[PDB]
Nucleic acid binder design. Structure first.
Lengths: 120, 55, 209, 122, 113
RNA sequence: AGGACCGAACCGACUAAUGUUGAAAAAUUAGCGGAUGACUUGUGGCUGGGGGUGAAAGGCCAAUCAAACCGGGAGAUAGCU
RNA sequence: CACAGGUGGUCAGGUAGAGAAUACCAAGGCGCUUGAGAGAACUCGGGUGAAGGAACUAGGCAAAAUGGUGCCGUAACUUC
RNA sequence: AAUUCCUUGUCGGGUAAGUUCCGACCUGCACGAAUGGCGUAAUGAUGGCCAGGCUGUCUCCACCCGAGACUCAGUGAAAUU
RNA sequence: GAUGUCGGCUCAUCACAUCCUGGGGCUGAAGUAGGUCCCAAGGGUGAUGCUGUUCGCCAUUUAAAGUGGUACGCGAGCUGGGUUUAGAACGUCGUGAGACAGUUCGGUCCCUAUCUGCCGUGGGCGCUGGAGAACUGAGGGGGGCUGCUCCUAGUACGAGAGGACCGGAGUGGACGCAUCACUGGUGUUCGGGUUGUCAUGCCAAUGGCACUGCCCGGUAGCUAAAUGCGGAAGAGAUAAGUGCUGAAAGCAUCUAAGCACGAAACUUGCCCCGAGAUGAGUUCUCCCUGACCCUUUAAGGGUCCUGAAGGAACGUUGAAGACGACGACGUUGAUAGGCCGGGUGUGUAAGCGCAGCGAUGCGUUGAGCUAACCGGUACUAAUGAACCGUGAGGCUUAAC
């Protein structure tokens, strides 16, 4: 059974998923849109959107927490300096998933995930 | 482990009676670009809902 | 007697003043509207058909809408029947409520048990596992034998094998009615009842008594 | 939960130090014995000049388990080890004259009121 | 679960003292001896607290008459008459299960100031 | 000092599982034994089939061994299928 | 076979470590030529289990357990 | 007794209960003195037996983590008949 | 031109020549207990020490530890201890090579299931216009065990010792089903501690990696050891048995006419499935009432207009699930994520101050974080479409 459980395991071990989403969240922050499989998005939301809600309030403690989650000081700075302020009035839902067809090498449901504002 | 008589071509056909694919029948048309696409998927030119989302 | 249609809310306890904790299942039984009465002349048997709860109007297909419209009642989440005893009698549109159970002391609760998916014989039928070591080869939870030999030459029907478990209709009989709270539409019965939280329950006065 | 091959301590001065459960009696295929159940034991370890000698087979009542007991409240009482009182095999009466350690209210049953009266607690 | 929430609310005690694991408490539990109802004290160190609203509990560990005993008291039970704190212990964990392997001097708990 | 001891490389191969149309015509994994010796390895040489070589098992002699492989006698013979 | 096997020699850095053990790294080299989902039984390879504790079994097979250094201490027996 | 058929001989030990074990007896079907007898420190991936420890071996399974299985896309066998 | 051997294991299934529990007759049956025979297969019918063992012998259970069939049931389910290959040794026999159901030590168990069978789970069609529900119950299946205590009643009975029938009540054991309120387990998706090492320029703070590195706790879910419940009472027909009236055959006689009783068997009652019950049922509701043409002229084909009730598809999903399926929800919306508040878990975060030579302590501070939980909230994603499905439903005879 899997009753009332959460979290896709995505055919990986826990270390691997954690590393992968750390990379993928860094990618989404710095590019503001990435293309990934539909199931790996929808798991990025549970990772990225808490980072923006964390970046709402700037403090040393908060930045150190973000750095712990995203071991990337450029990403931390962008969170707290652009995405924090940018989403200050939005109550979650900072990202947007757009189904985009299928991959050619494995027929994988592909999707775009992007920040809702995306400088537009 | 293994069969004891060769199955017939009739039994191939019967087993495969469930193997047929289903077509979409169901292309949606974007408001602005007017081009066809898979329901809930962006268009080939990057439209969805009738707004550019990719470019 | 007839019974009522409720919804499983959860479980909790009642502490009695002499220091006994009674586990209870909280079943909320809103008003059950009678939507049809079946009788010998028309239907060949005696029963009432009830509805309960509420349903979004956009989800009510107009066959159902017309059926509810005849009875003059609002749409519920479903329809259930209760065979009628010889003395019982109701009328279409009558609203039956929980205080029916005011003085019953035993109910039979019927629900759909939790669905366990495709289950092995160990979980589904309590088969004893074979040895984990001592030479066992790929055969730890497997079912073992399933038949005799050439003389039946077949597996008998009804053999216990793996397969779908749960998600089926289940009745637990003779449950103590701990409290009937008319104001809140609550029935509290002692013990566990089939199903998950939020599922439908059919609550009837105990047949076996 | 005392089953066959369980080693129990002895909560009476009958002389035994360690006894081993040999049969959870009182039913066919009966598995466990809780507080208040009669088990049959063998004596594995006895002090030198006691009233029972090692290798004896006799009955006993479990007075403490570390699986514990459930009270009707829902509360649970656990001990740090399993113990029993040796009982004469024919008349299930204690062999000892002192009882050590607390016992539990499940013994108040007209059959173990000796043990309750002699016990230091509960 | 609003309705279970208030079903439980109607039924929780309102005066449960605040204590923490490590504290020494005595608990007065009602004891019935046939016709007589008596109040018996079980005193020890709180080694665990399960706090779940009406289903709250706490484990109290004792060394009684030679060997250790621990009761899991169901807070909000009417069997528990009263709880009192005898001394306040200073520990860092929330579950003192390691005290089960300690005895005597090795089981001491610093007082909390 | 030592056919000493413990323990890598190295050389073996006691046990269990897995594999058994294998990743492999004997391996993998977890343990295991020896590890200055009657050791182990490189490169060349030498011994040939009723023969060799053998701390001996009918072991080994090119995934072949109570008598190698290849070609010939030879289309041996076969009251048997 | 682009095969988890076999194949002699030489060089060999740091931090812990007795070490060429092992852990993590450096220089350097790779990610093993099918991938994407789901999160059934059952299989394989692990982790953890209340109370018991060999009751298992042909047999403790397997697992679990022990493990280092200094120091104290150490039995029968003995070819010393 | 790596030997005794009868035989689980008999007696003692060890267990709650012991065809094994260990110590005796001798009634050696059918031991016996370099195709060595009898003992023996140390040693053995040696054979039997008994303890303590230790535990999912079991009472009796429960849950989790990964790789398959299942589904989709690409490729695409086999034994057998 | 191969039909795997014993035992254990894991699953069984049937017979009755019945071990228990149930009914009864006779007793050399006072009671308690038996003995023996008849009826009865509904359910139940041990786990151990030894030995490879079935068996046996034990030691303790139990209400009882049935007896047989089933290729001495079961190796394309498992084991391989024994047996029964090749090494070796002993006793023995043989000059020897070797041999012995004599012994002793060691000794490769392959199979991805086509078909039948079986457990699950779907698609197609049919059921006669289509659809959405709710049913009936023909059939199947499941369950169907028993202890002990107390009262009756120390009453009957007995010379005492002993000790009832019958009738009730309460607690068990095994077993099955549901569940997670509790008590626990697990919890590599939560928090903390700690070791080695590498990195973030460094201090501090963190991250990686070493089996989740090692651990200590733990949310939900799932689960047993946890907790609720249940195997009936009652009918109907009987078996062995016991009778009533009653002749044949002035008597008699349970039977021949007729009339009763009588058991865990049988049929119901309890629960679940179930109209492919092709014998395809019923009940209620909903929708569609436009033309035209050609020929075999007929339940005939085409054309145009129309497309309804519904359904599917797609998406967001679920205490549903291998996949289908099933259930919720799609902007008129809480379906999921997020966000907000709470809860829970870990236990006093960072930064700073202070004390101390320092490690560290202390305060800010039960602080900080907190997964699957609970209450909310359209912030994101659930798109207008489109697709399928039609246009009033045959014939005959009765009734109205």
């Amino acid at each position: 059974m899997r009753h009332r459980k959460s979290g896709r395991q995505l055919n990986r071990n826990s270390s691997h998923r954690q590393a992968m989403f750390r990379n993928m969240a860094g990618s989404l922050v710095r590019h503001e849109i990435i293309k990934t499989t539909l199931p790996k998005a929808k798991e990025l939301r549970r990772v990225v959107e808490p980072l923006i809600t964390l970046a709402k309030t700037d403090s040393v403690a908060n930045r150190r927490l973000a750095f712990a989650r995203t071991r990337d000081n450029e990403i931390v700075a962008k969170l707290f300096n652009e995405l924090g302020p940018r989403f200050a009035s939005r109550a979650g839902g900072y990202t947007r998933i757009l189904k985009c067809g299928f991959r050619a090498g494995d027929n994988a449901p592909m999707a775009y995930i992007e920040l809702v504002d995306r400088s537009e | 482990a293994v069969q004891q008589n060769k199955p017939t071509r009739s039994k191939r056909g019967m087993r495969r009676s469930h193997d047929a694919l289903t077509a979409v029948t169901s292309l949606s048309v974007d408001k602005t670009s007017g081009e066809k696409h898979l329901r809930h998927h962006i268009t080939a030119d990057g439209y969805y809902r009738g707004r550019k989302v990719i470019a | 007697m007839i019974g009522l249609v409720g919804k499983k809310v959860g479980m909790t306890r009642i502490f009695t003043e002499d220091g006994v904790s009674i586990p209870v299942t909280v079943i909320e039984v809103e008003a059950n509207r009678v939507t049809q009465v079946k009788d010998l002349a028309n239907d060949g048997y005696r029963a009432i058909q009830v509805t309960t709860g509420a349903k979004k109007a956009n989800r009510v297909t107009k066959p159902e809408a017309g059926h509810f419209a005849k009875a003059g009642v609002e749409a519920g989440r479903g329809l259930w029947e209760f065979r009628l005893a010889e003395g019982e009698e109701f009328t279409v549109g009558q609203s039956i409520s929980v205080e029916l159970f005011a003085d019953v002391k035993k109910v039979d609760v019927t629900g759909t048990s939790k669905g366990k998916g495709f289950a092995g014989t160990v979980k589904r039928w309590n088969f004893r596992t074979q040895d984990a070591t001592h030479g066992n080869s790929l055969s730890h939870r497997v079912p073992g034998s399933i038949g005799q030999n050439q003389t039946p030459g077949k597996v008998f029907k009804g053999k216990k094998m793996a397969g779908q478990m749960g998600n089926e209709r289940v009745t637990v009989q003779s449950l103590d009615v701990v409290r009937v709270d008319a104001e809140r539409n609550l029935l509290l019965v002692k013990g566990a009842v089939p199903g998950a939280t939020g599922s439908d329950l059919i609550v009837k006065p105990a047949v076996k008594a | 939960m005392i089953q066959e091959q369980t080693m129990l301590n002895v909560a009476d001065n009958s002389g035994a130090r360690r006894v081993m459960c040999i049969k959870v009696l009182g039913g066919s295929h009966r598995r466990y014995a809780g507080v208040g159940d009669i088990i049959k034991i063998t004596i594995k370890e006895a002090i030198p000049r006691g009233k029972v000698k090692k290798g004896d087979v006799l009955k006993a009542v479990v007075v403490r388990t570390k699986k514990g007991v459930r009270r009707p409240d829902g509360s649970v009482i656990r001990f740090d080890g399993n113990a029993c009182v040796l009982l004469n095999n024919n008349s299930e009466q204690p062999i000892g004259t002192r009882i050590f350690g607390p016992v539990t209210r499940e013994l108040r049953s007209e059959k173990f009121m000796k043990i309750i009266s002699l016990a230091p607690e509960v | 679960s609003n309705i279970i929430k208030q079903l439980e609310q109607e039924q929780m005690k309102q005066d449960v003292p605040s204590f923490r694991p490590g504290d020494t408490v005595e608990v007065k539990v009602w004891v019935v001896e046939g016709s007589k109802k008596r109040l018996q004290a079980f005193e020890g160190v709180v080694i665990a607290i399960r706090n779940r609203g009406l289903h709250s509990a706490f484990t109290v560990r004792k060394i009684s008459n030679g060997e250790g005993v621990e009761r899991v008291f169901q807070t909000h039970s009417p069997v528990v008459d009263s709880i009192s704190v005898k001394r306040r212990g200073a520990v860092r964990k929330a579950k003192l299960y390691y005290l089960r392997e300690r005895t005597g001097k090795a089981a001491r708990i610093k007082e909390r100031l």
